[PDB]
Curated annotation (Swiss-Prot):
This is Nuclear receptor subfamily 1 group I member 2. Residues 5-267 form the NR LBD domain. The keyword Isomerase does not apply. GO terms for molecular function: DNA-binding transcription activator activity, RNA polymerase II-specific; DNA-binding transcription factor activity, RNA polymerase II-specific; nuclear receptor activity; nuclear receptor binding; RNA polymerase II cis-regulatory region sequence-specific DNA binding; RNA polymerase II transcription regulatory region sequence-specific DNA binding; sequence-specific double-stranded DNA binding; zinc ion binding. It is found in: Nucleus. Heterodimer with RXR. Interacts with NCOA1. Interacts (via domain NR LBD) with CRY1 and CRY2 in a ligand-dependent manner. The gene is NR1I2. Expressed in liver, colon and small intestine. Keywords: Activator, DNA-binding, Metal-binding, Nucleus, Receptor, Transcription, Transcription regulation, Zinc, Zinc-finger. It comes from Homo sapiens. Its main location: nucleus. One of its GO terms (cellular component) is chromatin.
Amino acid sequence: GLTEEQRMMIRELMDAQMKTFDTTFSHFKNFRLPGVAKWSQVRKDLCSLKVSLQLRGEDGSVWNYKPPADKEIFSLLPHMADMSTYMFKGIISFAKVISYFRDLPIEDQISLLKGAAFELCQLRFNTVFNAETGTWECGRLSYCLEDGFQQLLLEPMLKFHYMLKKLQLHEEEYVLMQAISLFSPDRPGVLQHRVVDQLQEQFAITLKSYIECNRPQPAHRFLFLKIMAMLTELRSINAQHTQRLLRIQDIHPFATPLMQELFGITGSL
């Protein structure tokens, strides 16, 4: 029941995702690893989820990292920044191949990427998340949660990942969530709010139509409304964490140059 315009929309988003999402993470190389007052509040701003780290070598060897309990709380920041930078490069490439994004003014493209890069990284990471092992499988890398799973899901970011996985979405539904998020007109600095708003609505209407034609089962009743609600929660998680990272960055610098560009850091003052 999809119009030809809506089919072309999904086709181009899937093509964008196919070219810019290294599902096997095979090109993520040379990354850093844990070495072989305001600081009381800095401890409340870290990734509150404790993760062990796995590295499967091509020969069969396994390097495994167990972290310590609570300046040793900063040992994982350089590695996180490198992974973050590798994800952000793919997300920017995903945006630049989309025609609807390519046609926006260059200053509006920058404003939209600044507000949505975190959200798309979360969305792409959910696809490699294993809710049955508590693990984000990134090719030869693994971020496994440390052990129950009821007191751990009070953290909103982890609860977001378990709930999004439970919806059992298609690849097409994931890429449409990326599009709706990337084209949010209420981001700080956007000029063509009317243009971005009309684009966002067509993306959401395409998603609602996709669910109507491809999912008749009663388990997918209100699925489109459930997805829109999660996009609103993903955005609250984004705002709460942007301030948390900027607090840490003032006390313990870690952000890469590409992360500074997306956070508005100038290098002066």
